[PDB]
Amino acid sequence: FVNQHLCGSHLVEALYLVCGERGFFYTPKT
Amino acid sequence: FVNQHLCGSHLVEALYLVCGERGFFYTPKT
Amino acid sequence: FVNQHLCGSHLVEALYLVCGERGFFYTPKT
Amino acid sequence: FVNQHLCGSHLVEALYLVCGERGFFYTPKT
Amino acid sequence: FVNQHLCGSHLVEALYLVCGERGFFYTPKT
Amino acid sequence: FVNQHLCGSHLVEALYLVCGERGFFYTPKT
Amino acid sequence: GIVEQCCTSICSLYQLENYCN
Amino acid sequence: GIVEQCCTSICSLYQLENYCN
Amino acid sequence: GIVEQCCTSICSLYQLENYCN
Amino acid sequence: GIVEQCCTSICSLYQLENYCN
Amino acid sequence: GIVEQCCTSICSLYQLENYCN
Amino acid sequence: GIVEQCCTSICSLYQLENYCN
Ligand SMILES: [Cl-]
Ligand SMILES: [Cl-]
Ligand SMILES: [Zn+2]
Ligand SMILES: [Zn+2]
Known part of the structure; x- marks a missing residue:
């Protein structure tokens, strides 16, 4: 595919895309 | 605040707004 | 909840979320 | 431009693009 | 990656993420 | 309408809006 | 209204x- | 769950x- | 206004x- | 096509x- | 192109x- | 983490x- 900068919403939407039904965690504190 | 009807990526967007820097976990059934 | 920077689209989507059926005004000139 | 089928937050996104710095009011029924 | 159910603008968002700097063409029927 | 800065996703969503059924190409290399 | 008609x-x-304003 | 209930x-x-975390 | 307050x-x-209205 | 199949x-x-291009 | 023109x-x-096509 | 890696x-x-989970 590619590499881009993915931040906030944009970043979340990507995780939603990539993970979908598996689910995912967004943990910006780390 | 008002109640929400959210499907798909629109649920992840809401979680994003609601949780902020705390982040969140997205965990659908199956 | 939290506080974040909410700008343009992101800002509008938030207002949509928070206000929903009440409706809202986005008036950036002020 | 073409005609549009817009529900939910996708209507607010369109208003955002269309109105720009003028801003807009979002006023649903009930 | 998982399979996707994407309508409307959510298809263009996916294409955007998937293609990156390569860009893409969006070509619906009719 | 107006003129604003439209970048990435935001830019794509706009093209989707303006072009819809005609379809469109997003070709950032140019 | 507009909200309902677009949908x-x-x-x-x-x-x-x-x-628009 | 939440994912299904909101939809x-x-x-x-x-x-x-x-x-939230 | 909103932009200064929230952005x-x-x-x-x-x-x-x-x-909200 | 793709547009219709994903939906x-x-x-x-x-x-x-x-x-992609 | 588009990016320079619009972004x-x-x-x-x-x-x-x-x-558009 | 994610933010540093992806943003x-x-x-x-x-x-x-x-x-992903
Ligand atoms: Cl942005
Ligand atoms: Cl939708
Ligand atoms: Zn949608
Ligand atoms: Zn954005």
């Missing part, structure tokens, strides 16, 4: 523009 | 907040 | 409710 | 990738 | 139509 | 899969 039927950007 | 029915921001 | 600066979901 | 059925990121 | 610079909805 | 820096769709 249940179709609407134009020109009709949208009427809701 | 098939309705959900609140307060119920959403339970899924 | 240039930082705002809560409660401040955002100041712009 | 009416399901589609993969790998099939999406075919529409 | 780096500023573009109208009419300029955007230059990229 | 501050640059990440692939494959790196993003590191954050």
Whole structure:
């Protein structure tokens, strides 16, 4: 595919895309 | 605040707004 | 909840979320 | 431009693009 | 990656993420 | 309408809006 | 209104523009 | 769960907040 | 206004409710 | 086509990738 | 191109139509 | 973490899969 900068919403939407039904965690504190 | 009807990526967007820097976990059934 | 920077689209989507059926005004000139 | 089928937050996104710095009011029924 | 159910603008968002700097063409029927 | 800065996703969503059924190409290399 | 018409039927950007400030 | 309830029915921001870290 | 309050600066979901109708 | 298949059925990121430039 | 016209610079909805098929 | 990997820096769709459950 590619590499881009993915931040906030944009970043979340990507995780939603990539993970979908598996689910995912967004943990910006780390 | 008002109640929400959210499907798909629109649920992840809401979680994003609601949780902020705390982040969140997205965990659908199956 | 939290506080974040909410700008343009992101800002509008938030207002949509928070206000929903009440409706809202986005008036950036002020 | 073409005609549009817009529900939910996708209507607010369109208003955002269309109105720009003028801003807009979002006023649903009930 | 998982399979996707994407309508409307959510298809263009996916294409955007998937293609990156390569860009893409969006070509619906009719 | 107006003129604003439209970048990435935001830019794509706009093209989707303006072009819809005609379809469109997003070709950032140019 | 506009909110319901764009969803249940179709609407134009020109009709949208009427809701700008 | 929450994912299904917000879509098939309705959900609140307060119920959403339970899924924050 | 909203832009200064929520974009240039930082705002809560409660401040955002100041712009509802 | 792809536009209709992702909506009416399901589609993969790998099939999406075919529409990149 | 589009990025320079609409992101780096500023573009109208009419300029955007230059990229439709 | 994710923010440093994918926002501050640059990440692939494959790196993003590191954050799925
Ligand atoms: Cl942005
Ligand atoms: Cl939708
Ligand atoms: Zn949608
Ligand atoms: Zn954005």
